[PDB]
A paper describes a structure:
For the levan utilisation system, the cell surface components are Bt1760 (a GH32 endo-levanase), Bt1761 (a surface glycan-binding protein; SGBP), Bt1762 (SusD) and Bt1763 (SusC)15,19,24. SusC proteins are unique among TBDTs in that they are tightly associated with a SusD substrate-binding lipoprotein15–17. Recently, we showed that SusCD complexes mediate substrate uptake via a “pedal bin” mechanism. The SusC transporter forms the barrel of the bin, while SusD sits on top of the barrel, opening and closing like a lid to facilitate substrate binding.
To visualise potential different conformational states, we used single-particle cryo-EM on detergent-solubilised apo-Bt1762-63. Strikingly, several distinct conformations of the SusC2D2 complex are present in a single dataset, and after further classification steps, three dominant states were identified. Following three-dimensional (3D) reconstruction, electron density maps were obtained at resolutions allowing rigid body placement and refinement of individual protomers. This yielded structures corresponding to the three possible combinations of open and closed dimeric transporters: OO (3.9 Å), OC (4.7 Å) and CC (4.2 Å). With the exception of a few Bt1763 loops (L6 and L7) and the Bt1762 segment following the lipid anchor that serves as a pivot around which Bt1762 moves upon lid opening, the conformational changes between the three states correspond to rigid body movements of Bt1762. Interestingly, the presence of the plug domain in the interior of the Bt1763 barrel in solution is strictly correlated with the open vs. closed state of the transporter; only open states contain a plug domain, regardless of the state of the SusC2D2 dimer. In the open, apo state of the SusCD transporter as observed via cryo-EM, the Ton box of Bt1763 (82DEVVVTG88) is visible, tucked away inside the barrel, and interacts with the body of the plug. Hinge1 and 2 change conformation substantially during lid opening and are responsible for the majority of interactions between Bt1762 and Bt1763 in the open state.
Numbering used by the authors:
A (entry chain B): 330 to 378
B (entry chain B): 134 to 1016
C (entry chain B): 477 to 575
D (entry chain A): 1 to 552
Write the structure that this text describes.
Amino acid sequence: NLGVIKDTDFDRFSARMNSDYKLIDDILTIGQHFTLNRTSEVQAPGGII
Amino acid sequence: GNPSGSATVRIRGIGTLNNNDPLYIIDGVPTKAGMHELNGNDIESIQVLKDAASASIYGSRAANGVIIITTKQGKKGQIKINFDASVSASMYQSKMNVLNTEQYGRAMWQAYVNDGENPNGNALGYAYNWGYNADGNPVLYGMTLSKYLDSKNTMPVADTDWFDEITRTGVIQQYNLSVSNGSEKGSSFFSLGYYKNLGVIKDTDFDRFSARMNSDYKLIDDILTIGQHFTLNRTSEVQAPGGIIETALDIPSAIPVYASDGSWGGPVGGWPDRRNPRAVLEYNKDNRYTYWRMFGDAYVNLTPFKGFNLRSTFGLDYANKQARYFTYPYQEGTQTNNGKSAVEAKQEHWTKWMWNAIATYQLEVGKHRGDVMIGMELNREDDSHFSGYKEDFSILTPDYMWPDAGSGTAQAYGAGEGYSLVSFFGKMNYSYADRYLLSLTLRRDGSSRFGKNHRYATFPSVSLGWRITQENFMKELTWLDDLKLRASWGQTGNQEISNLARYTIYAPNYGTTDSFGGQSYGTAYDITGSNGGGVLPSGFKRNQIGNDNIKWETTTQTNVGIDFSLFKQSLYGSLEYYYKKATDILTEMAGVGVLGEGGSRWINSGAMKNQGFEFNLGYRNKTAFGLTYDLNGNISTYRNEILELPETVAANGKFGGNGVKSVVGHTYGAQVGYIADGIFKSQDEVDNHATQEGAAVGRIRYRDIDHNGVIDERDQNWIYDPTPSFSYGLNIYLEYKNFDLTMFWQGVQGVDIISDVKKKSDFWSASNVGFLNKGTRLLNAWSPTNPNSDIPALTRSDTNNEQRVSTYFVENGSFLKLRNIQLGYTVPAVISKKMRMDRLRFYCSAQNLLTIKSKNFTGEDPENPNFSYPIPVNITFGLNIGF
Amino acid sequence: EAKQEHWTKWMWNAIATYQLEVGKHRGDVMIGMELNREDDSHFSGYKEDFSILTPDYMWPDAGSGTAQAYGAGEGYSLVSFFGKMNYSYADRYLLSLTL
Amino acid sequence: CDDFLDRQVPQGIVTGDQIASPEYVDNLVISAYAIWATGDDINSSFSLWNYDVRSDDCYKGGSGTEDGGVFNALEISKGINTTDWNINDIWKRLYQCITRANTALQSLDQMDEKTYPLKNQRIAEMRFLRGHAHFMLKQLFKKIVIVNDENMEPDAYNELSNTTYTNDEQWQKIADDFQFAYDNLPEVQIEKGRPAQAAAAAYLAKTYLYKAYRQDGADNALTGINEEDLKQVVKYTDPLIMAKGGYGLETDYSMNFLPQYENGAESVWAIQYSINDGTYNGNLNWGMGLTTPQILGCCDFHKPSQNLVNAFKTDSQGKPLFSTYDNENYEVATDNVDPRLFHTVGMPGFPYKYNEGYIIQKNDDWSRSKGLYGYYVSLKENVDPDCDCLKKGSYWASSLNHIVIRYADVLLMRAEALIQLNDGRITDAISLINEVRSRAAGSTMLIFNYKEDYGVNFKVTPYDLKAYAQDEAMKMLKWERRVEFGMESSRFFDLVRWGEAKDVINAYYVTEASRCSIYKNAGFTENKNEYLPVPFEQISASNGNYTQNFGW
C-alpha cells in the first residue's frame, strides 16, 4: 500500500501452516497452528495536514 | 566439551590460509553458520560432497566442500509417531594435577637453595628450619606456615582445591516428539524438541527449543506441487569467560575462597595478581544471550508434458541475538576494578534470501538415458548490529541494571554489512549401455565482492566412470559382484574475501575512541586558537586502499576412485586418491614506505597443494551362533605443502616458521626451533659442550648444527608439523537375540603437539609473573640427591633462556579412545503390541569412557593439551517409545 | 536513534470436558486451569554530529558527538481455574452456568 | 540481471569515488592539518625532540639507565644499528603527513574559480605543509625520495628512487612549494592556525640558507660555500614583510612559553593544542608526555646538561666567556648570569614554573635516577601543576601551543645571511644582534623579585657599533643561537649545517666523561654519524631502488 500523502507506505509478507493428525481410532490427536509476518511501514509525521 | 557443542570442521584437510569453513545446505537454502542450534534429530540423509568436480555445481563458494543435509518427510500410508528421551550425567576425568601448600613451600625452598640465598627472607608467610648435610647438599628439616596472610589478619590460610571448586557434576536432559502423515496426494511432518545441558564448569549452560513443519501437496495428476519446510529455534547460552582453566591453574592454593567475612579472598600482598576464579564464575552468571532463528522454503513444481520438470524455490534465513553483558565492582586484596559498574545491551540481526529456477529434462531411448538441467540463482545478505552502554549504577542486581537506571557516561555502536550473488549453471548425464557413465557441469557465477575488472567467473567440470562386472569378458570372476572405476577433474573457488577489498575506505575518526600512547590518528585540529569548547571541525583520514583487480581463490582438484563389492553383497568399500591445488590465496600486504597511512592493499598470490588416500570398508554377516555383526571402518592419509608465498609475509612468519625460516616448501603451520637432548648431568659438560651462554648443573643442552661453538640463532630446524598420517576410525555393531550393542573407536597415529602445560609444569620461572602455582611434576626435578630425572633444576631466575621453542615442548599426540558405547534392549512383540504400540526400547550408553596413549606424553588429555574447555564423560540412561 | 523492542507471551491450559446423553437430556461439564507470562523489553542508542548526510552513512559508529542510551523492561503473570455447564432436558429449556 | 548486482552500498563509511566530490572539501585540508597535533608517539614527537639528545645539551632523562636502550645508543654515537626501530618509525610518521597533504592536493584539482575564490590559498597551505614535512625529513636523513606530483597512482610509489635527484635539485624541489606559497598566501589570516605570508617567507629563507651550504658529493663534508642564493635569502627576509601582519618581538622571553596567552607576536606559525574539545582527552601535546618531572608521578625524561648551564654564565662585562666556561661550575651566587637561565631550566633552590610551593631539592622526588643524570628540570615545555593545561590520561601533558618558527629565528637567520654575504654590510647585522641582545636584556619582569630571597645578578650588555672580525662575530652569533635556542631542538642541525660538528661533539664527550658515568666510553666518528641511517626495511623492500647513507 502506498498512501495518498507522499512518502508513506506499508507492506506485509505472510505465511501460515496448519495441520492435525489423529492416530489410534481418535484417542490421540496432535495439531499445530503457526504464522509468520513481516511489516515495514514508513510513518507520516505529526501534524502534516 | 562446550555445552553448545560447536565444531571446527575441515574437509579433505586444510585447503586455504584464511577462513575455510564448509558450506552447509539445509533443504536447498544454504547457510555457512550454525548447526549447533539446529534441531539435530529431523535428519533423513547427510551427503558430504568432498570432491570439487561433483561439488562444482553448487557454487563458487564450494571450494571447501559442501555438506548436503535433508530433512524427513511423510511416507505413503503411514501415521507413525515416535517419542524419544534421555537423562544423562557429566563427570570430570581430565584434571591436571597441581601442587598444594606443602609442595609449594618445598619448591620455593628448593629454588632458593639452588640460588644459595636464604629462603627465610621471602615475601610470603613461610618459615624454614633447614641446614647443611655433610655431603654439601642442603636438607630442609622443618617447614612452618603462618596463621594469617597479612599483618592486618584479613585472610586466613588454607589448602583450596581450585579444580574441585569450579567444577560440578552436570545433568543433561533431552526430549523429542515426531508425528508423520502421508497419502497419495499429500504428505506432512511435524516435530518438536528440547535439550538442556549444564556444563562441567560451574555456571555455564545451554538449552535449545525447536520446531519443524514440512509438507507438500500434489494437485492435478502431478503437474502442480507446492511444498514447504520451516524451522524455529531458541537457544539461551551462558558463556564461560576467557581463560578460566588457566586462571584455575595459576592461582596458588593457599588463597581461600572466602575472606573473614562473606567476601571473596584474594592475593593481599606478595602473591601475584590473579583473580579468584570462583568470583569470575560468580560474576559471569547472568550474561545470558537469546538467539531466535527461522528457515523457509516454498518450492513449486510443474511438468508441462512428460519427463520435464520446472521448479522455483524461495529461501529465507532470519536470526537475531539479544544479549546484556554486565560488569561489577570487585575487591580481593589488591584485585579491585576501582568501583566500576556498567551494562552493555547488544543486538545483532541477520537476513538471507535466495531464489532459483531450475528446469530439468529426462529421456530414455534405446539403452541411453540423460538428464540436462539449467537454472539461475540469486542471493542477498543483510547483516547488522548495534549496542549501548551506561555507567555507575547504584544497586547491583541483574534486573536493576537496565540502561535507564544509571548516572554515568554512555556510548553507542553499530555497523552494517552486505553481499549479493547471481549465477547460472548446468549439468548433464549419460550411460549409453548401463556401462559407461559420464557427467559434465558448468557454472557461470558473479558475486558482489569481485573487482570492477571482471564480474562473472566460469567454473568447468568433467567427470567419468565405467563399470567392470557388466563387461562380458569378466563373467568368469563370479565371486565378485560389482567393481566401478571413476575419475574426475573440477575447478571451483571460494569468495570469502573481506567485503571492502575493492573500495579504498575513508573514515572520519574524530578521536572520541581511546588510543593509549597518544597515537590517536584523529582529524580534529582546533583552528582560531580557541583552546576549549567542543565545536571543533572534522575531516577524513584514510583507512586502507583497495585494488580493482581482486579475484576468487580458485582450486583445481582431480580425483581417482575405485569401488568394489564381493561375496554376495559383502565387503563393500571404496579406495580414493586426490590431488588439489589452490592457486590464488589472498594476503593483505602493508604499504611500503612513502605510501604512508592506509597502504594495506589486498592482493592474491599464494598456492597450496594437498594429496592423500581414503579407504573405507564394511563387513556385515550373520553367523551360525545366533548373532549378527557389522564392522564399518575407514583409514585416511593426509599430506600438505605450501607451493609459494609472495613476499616478506613468508619471512616474518604469519603462517609458518617463527620469523627465522621461510615457509615455502614445507607444510602449513610448521614451527622452527632448537633441539634439546638432555641435561648437564656431569660437571665436565661445561667444556664437553661448545660455548653455551647459560651453563649450569641444570639448563638443558642444545645441539650444534654448524659445529662451530654455535649457540646462535643459526641452529634451528623444522621440529613440528601438525599434519598426521594414519588417521582412522572403526564402528562395531552387534546383534544378539533381543539385544543390541554398539561400540566405537577412533584414533590417529603419529601426531606432534605443542604443549604449554609442560612449560607450566616443568619450569619454576618460565612465565612473566613470579610465585605462580604450577603442576606437580617439577617436585621430582634434578637434584644432587636425585640424578635420575630428565626434569631440569629449579632456579629462581631465567638465567639460561629456556622459553625458546625447542624439542623439549613436542609430545607424541597419537591416541585411541572409545567415543561411545551403547547397549539396548528391545521389548518383545506381544507385550509391546498389547499396549497398541509398535516398538519399545530401554537403552543405556556412555561416552568417552577410556583412552590409551603413548609413553611419550606426560599430560592428561591427548586431544587438547592446552587450556580449552575439557572433555567430560557422559553416561546416558534413555528410552525410545515408538508407536 | 536506533531503537529495538521485544515482546514475548506464552500460555498453557489443560481443559477436560465430559459429554453425556440419556433420555432427553444432554450436558457438557468441563474444568481446566490456565497460565500466562508476558516479558516485554526495549532499548535504544543515540549519536550526534555526523559528516555525510545519507541513510547508510548514518550508523552510530560514524559519528563524533555525544551519545546516550535507554532501556526498560516489563512483566505480567496470571493463573486461573474455570468451569462450564450445559443442559437442555427436553430440547426446550436451555441452561448454562460458568464460574 | 546485472542491475541486481550493483545495488548494495557499504555502510558506515565513505568510499573512494565520492571522496573526490567538490562538496566534501574543507574536510581534507583540516585532516591534513590535524596530523601535526595528533599522530605521534610518546617515543617520537614531531618537534624532533628525541632525535637530538646527542647534541651536547641533554642527558636523555633516564629513569632507568637503559630503559629506552636504543636512545642511549643514539646519545652516545656508538653502536647504533641499521635495523633499529625508531628510525623506521620516524620515517613512516613523516611520510604519513606527506600522504595526507598529497591526498588533499589531489582532491583540490576539481574545483573552479566561479563559486570558490580560495583555490590558490588552499593549494598554498597544502603545499606549505608538504614542503615543511619534506624540509624536516631532509634535515633528518638528507638523502630522501621526494614526491611532488599530486596525481600519482599508488602503483608507482614503489618504483621511486632518491638517487635521481642530487642535493641542490632536492633543495630546489623543497623551495618550489614554499615559493609558490609566497606567491599566493594572504598577509593576514583571521584564524591564527593557518600560516601567512611571513611563514612562507621564513621557510623559503630556511630552505635557501640550507641550500647555500654546498655539499658536492657522497661525503658529508663542507665545501666552497655558494653566494648566489644569498641575494634571494636577504631579499626574502626584508623586515617590512614581517611588519606586515604584526609579527614582531614580544616584551618578555618568558611570554611565549606561558599558557595564559598563547598566540602573540613571536608565534609565526604554531601547532595548536587544545583541551576540553569534544574528543576523548583533548588534543594535548602527547609528544612531551615524558618531560614532566617526578612531581606528578613520572617520567623525568629530557633533562638539560651541565655544559648549557655553564654556557649561560656571563662575566661582569655582560658577554659570554669564549670557551673558558666549562672549567668552573656555573653558580649564580658567584658571578653574573644570563636571565634566560631561570626561563629555560629550573635549578635546585628555585621555584618550579614560578611556584613558591615547589622549590626544587635534590631528593628522590625530582629524579628517579639518583646521581646518574643529576637534578635538573626543563621549563621550556612544562607548566605549573595549578594549570587547567594538565590532564592525566596515563600521562601528564600540557596544552601549550608549540611554536616551530619564531621572530628571533628569522632575525638570527637574517644575521647569518648578512655575515655570510660580508659585502660591506657587516655592522647592520651587528646592530640587529645588538637589538636581539637588548630585547633579551629587557625581558626580565617575572623572576626579578628573587634578588631579595635568593641573591642574583644578571646583565646582558650589548656591543658597540663597529665592524668586528668575521670569525669573532660568527662565534658571537653561534653563542647567541646556543643561548637563545636551548631545549628547542635546534642545535644538532645547526652543527651539521655549519659542518664543524664532530670536533665539538668529541670535545663535549671528553669534557663530560667526568660528569656522567655513561659518557666515559664515547666517540663520534667522522663522515658516518652525522645523519641518521636509512632504515634497513625500506632498502630491503625497495629491491635496490633506494640507497644507503655514506659510511653505512
